[PDB]
Amino acid sequence: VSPPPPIADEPLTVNTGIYLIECYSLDDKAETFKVNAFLSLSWKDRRLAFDPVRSGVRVKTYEPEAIWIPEIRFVNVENARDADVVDISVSPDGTVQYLERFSARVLSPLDFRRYPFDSQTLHIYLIVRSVDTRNIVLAVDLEKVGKNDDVFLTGWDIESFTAVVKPANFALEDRLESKLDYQLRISRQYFSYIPNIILPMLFILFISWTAFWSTSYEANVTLVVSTLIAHIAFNILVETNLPKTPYMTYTGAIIFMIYLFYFVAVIEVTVQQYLKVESQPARAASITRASRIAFPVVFLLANIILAFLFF
Amino acid sequence: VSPPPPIADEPLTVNTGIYLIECYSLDDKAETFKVNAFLSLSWKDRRLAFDPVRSGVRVKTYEPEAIWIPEIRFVNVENARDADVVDISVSPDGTVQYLERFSARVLSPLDFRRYPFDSQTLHIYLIVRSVDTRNIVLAVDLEKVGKNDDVFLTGWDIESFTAVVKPANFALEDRLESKLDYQLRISRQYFSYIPNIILPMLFILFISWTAFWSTSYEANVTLVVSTLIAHIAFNILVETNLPKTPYMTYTGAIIFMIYLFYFVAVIEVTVQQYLKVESQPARAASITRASRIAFPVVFLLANIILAFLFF
Amino acid sequence: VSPPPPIADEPLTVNTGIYLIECYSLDDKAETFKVNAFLSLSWKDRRLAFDPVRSGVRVKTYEPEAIWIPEIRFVNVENARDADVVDISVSPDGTVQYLERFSARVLSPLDFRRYPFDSQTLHIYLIVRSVDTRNIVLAVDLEKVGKNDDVFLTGWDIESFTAVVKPANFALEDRLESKLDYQLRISRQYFSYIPNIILPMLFILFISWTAFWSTSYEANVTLVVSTLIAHIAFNILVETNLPKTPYMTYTGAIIFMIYLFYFVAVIEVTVQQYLKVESQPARAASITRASRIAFPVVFLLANIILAFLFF
Amino acid sequence: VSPPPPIADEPLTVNTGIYLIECYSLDDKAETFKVNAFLSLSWKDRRLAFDPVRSGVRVKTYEPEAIWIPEIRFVNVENARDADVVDISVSPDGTVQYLERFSARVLSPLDFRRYPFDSQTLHIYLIVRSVDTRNIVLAVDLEKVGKNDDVFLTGWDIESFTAVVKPANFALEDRLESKLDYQLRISRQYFSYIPNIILPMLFILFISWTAFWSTSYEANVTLVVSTLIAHIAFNILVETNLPKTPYMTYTGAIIFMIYLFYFVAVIEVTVQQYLKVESQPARAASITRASRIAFPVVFLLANIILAFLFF
């Protein structure tokens, strides 16, 4: 079976639609998500036209093997989609209506700059390669784009699922390709990060600052070094949920900055002890009293500066 | 092969049944479970009618390829089910009895609010899409719904496996869909959480309170900070077995609240030391004595309040 | 192809055999194991009978497609077995000898009560569903049941592989099922648990008891709290190799009991310090001296009681 | 279908091309990467020649089954590539133009000597085995070699994708093999290693050196041993992201060297304490003062020497 022949010199328009049934497994490290959806295709094939009066039937059902079907592929998939044809219907004028249900692991880059307060635009790129007899061009049937109300992506809020209606037409190996961009806009449910990572991380930091109300070097060393090790455990925990980025994320910036605070608290604790041994406790008392104000104040201002640069 | 023709204007009724053979791998993080079951289907196709006198047999066996079979799909599966046809029996009136054995990874959301004392209703949604020639509607044969006595889901108790007998019939892409809800009610075996997470977590918390019977700042700092780090290890352990939820779980609430207790114990330990250095041990003694009662009392009342809000 | 016809009203006997080639991947958490074996089937088909004088041949080889073969399935498998037919031999009387090689992931529950000194009975349940024309019943050919001498299951000793010769015959969805139970008896190689978990766990416990020969609260607090944290690391290590059980395991019971010992050692260390501060060191000396005997004695007796309840 | 016949005694030239669509999952431990690309093949088959005047058509489309196609394989793949034929076009002279889209897990060794500041040359080796009737030789069509602009490999920068145009022609099992080398040059995005591993590791090292401004043995022991344990946690973290190499990596060398610094700081801390107890604090003061300069100076010079040997 060959492609439908043109009346003039017009390309063949394959109208498309994607109806999401399931969204699952958004893997941040892999920058992938799994999708279960309906792919609907429609085009005119005059060779398939019939008279409903003469044939009796208003529509004709076909097996994929019996007719020409455009080879539609996904650009950003790991392996070719697992697809199962649901129906093929042909109106008297030869308008074919094809429907298949598929599943696919989609590869789509994520911007982690504002993590865990980030929003993403996931993409599903549909593509068709033209043949020598005909140039094939893709279109969007908006009445056939959508998602099931129950569609849930664990740890994310689905905002919208739309299609950029004008395809990106280009040459690849001296043949025309027509590409469509289906965009799934999502925003991360940041909630759990607050009681599990953010507040525990602040609590251990504030505990290290109790060393500014202590003259005991041994206890101070314990407070600052112990909490520093717990900070390292949180840094390791966070970086295991994320891929390695060539930029700084919001959480990464805070986590990094908090090390400087631990480092400066060790200097203070060291200086205090040194002065007391040198019989200068009055000078050490001045440094410790200033630290009580300076550490929370510089921490609050540094955080305002960071929140400003990132949001 | 086309669908069976109607006598009047009646939809074709495909009776269904699901008999569970195996339940395994309830993945809390993924919100999935694996199932191995029997899917039985039954419909009338009068085109398949036969006379046992003329044919010899009283029931005819068919290969799936030989006859029209309704395209029945699962809504909430990751990939299309692994299925193997066991039997296709046709009786003289044209009634077809179809039996297949399948295995599928089912995606079903879980409510972790009361974790690890939670119950869940797992769902298996069966669906059929109508054709232009006929509207296909699903029914439940209750005599064909059940589960093997040996069906065990590691770490869970299976309560019941029933079907909501009235299908959800609705429009989807200008065709009718008939959906059935099969519900597997389960409840978590909370037992192991007690000696492995809950009691160890309470023991280390009670150990931190021994600081209220000590005047040694160095020892108190070690007791409270060391046990706090062990609490962080339990928080990390717990959160690795759970997905990130946009709500607070019972365990999460307790784990979070216990940080406040560690934070306030550090303040007490700091205050006590400060007063002793300022030559006010009588005042410090009053605060430490009150803490001995206040900490267990507030811990018990806070826990009663939490158990009330969650149960 | 239809099933063989009966002479009288007798069921068709399908003689079975399982010869293990490989045993691997006993996953304790999943409660699964992987098997690579031979499945042999034997039944009589009179339609297939021939005279070896007239035909010349003593046996006839067949392709699966050419003859009727009973649909034999495994009950407790994750997915249907990956099978490859090795041979089909038909003798003059019509006795068919079928041989296939298969691989399957078998789901079989494990009793962890005596872990890591436990023995298990793994099961492979074979099943056949009867047809309308004939009732099919399973039998065991003992000469065709066995295992390769080289069959090794990493971390386990294989004791025996036998079959319960009488099938479980029962009705399921108004048809007869014939089920056979093939039992693989294994016992855990507990050896490695001794130098890697048990003895390290006892060493750190005995190290905490050195606090009974020390009057230094600061050092005592370090000894008891540090070793307690190492105990938590062993508890976490152990519980990651096991599924969550609605009962107590042997190791779990010991691990749990050892927490009580750490808790009571903290009370002793606290009491001793308190009395010394209250200028009562003679009383504290009496409690520490008793603890030196009481702690090992109660530890040994509690362990004897536990070993008795579990074995 | 047999291979095309030669005019003289010339080998059959199969022109090749690889156009990358997706690059993903560069697994450092496994030394593998996943690829989704176009494989284009072109050869002449005189048997397929036609007159475009007589046949009307300018090109002829074929199904793979209809014509002879060379068996082209990948050398360094885990399993055979998952391939789907896109097009087969035949010009009037008999020049066949074959295009397939494939996905493959490619096994390619990595040099970790300069990790995490390393560059790699990933290889995709194409091969063809000659037949008895004809010797098949591979060529590169440079116009059919390339990559999608959007091609991203998480944690890496793609520099170039080129082919070594001259094949490696060699005998293997008394038949000719023609092998082509497609090279994907990449360089690691080292950025994230700086705030997550390198700077945290230096901070804890500098914290241990504060012991050189302290006369408190107890505090010193805590500072040096605690930071040493945090170093061990970083060493373990790093070595889990890398395979075991029969050579030293850059990071490995630094991580190893830093242990010697911790070991010598423990000797210093021990010596100081010993002298103070022996009533020689003047001598200890001289050693501690020298260590304040010696430790950072030797650390800086040792690092210059290492950076020189590795870069």
Place this chain on the structure above:
Amino acid sequence: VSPPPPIADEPLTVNTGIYLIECYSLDDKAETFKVNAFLSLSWKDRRLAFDPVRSGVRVKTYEPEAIWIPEIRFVNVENARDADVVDISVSPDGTVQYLERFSARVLSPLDFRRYPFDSQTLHIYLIVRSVDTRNIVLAVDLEKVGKNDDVFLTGWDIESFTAVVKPANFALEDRLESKLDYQLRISRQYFSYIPNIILPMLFILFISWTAFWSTSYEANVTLVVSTLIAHIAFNILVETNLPKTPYMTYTGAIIFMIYLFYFVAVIEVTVQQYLKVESQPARAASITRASRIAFPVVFLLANIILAFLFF
């Protein structure tokens, strides 16, 4: 298609060869490795003989379906090999030359006694089952056994790939089986274990011995307990890379023995403190001075004894 008929009563000899293309994923825990190789087979089928004069052709190419091919299987594979036929060639006398490329996950036991200084002999067992018409026997064509020069097994050195030329002929389910043993001799690249596990483990052990030059119980307790916890972290790290063995490995023996050294150092530290409190520091000084020599001396001799028993 039936097997070739014998001239006399001679068995059918299938000559075999395995040429390794890729070796990868030697999983120590699973005791498996993945292989990508060529399997070549050769046998005589007189029914396939032709006159080169009459037919013109010197060799005849066949599709697997067209002729009888021996069912050759691998004994120690997880699942049946993924195989693709490269060529089937038939000389005029009827000698068939079959070549296929395959990939397989091979299950082969490993001896960890000398880990990480161990050598292994990996096995690939080829097998053929006899038929009633003929006894099929396997042979090795040594000119067709080998490996690609580029064959690399990450973390291992490949020494040789040879075949035990005489098959192990035996009865299995009343048919003769012909088995061949292909042996891949490898030796572990122990290098990385030295800077990553062995030297770090010795450094922390030597640090605990600095307690023998200290009279500070509090500091001693910190030194010995902190380093002991780091030893536990190394024990856990090592045992995660290895399966549980019913014997002691070299590393396991050293790791275990080092616990006894930590235990005895705690006794010494305890004894020293006890004597000082009892006003016997002269006696404690004698024990501490002896320990300075005794601990390194007993450590060196115990290690010589262990190296002797294991090598």
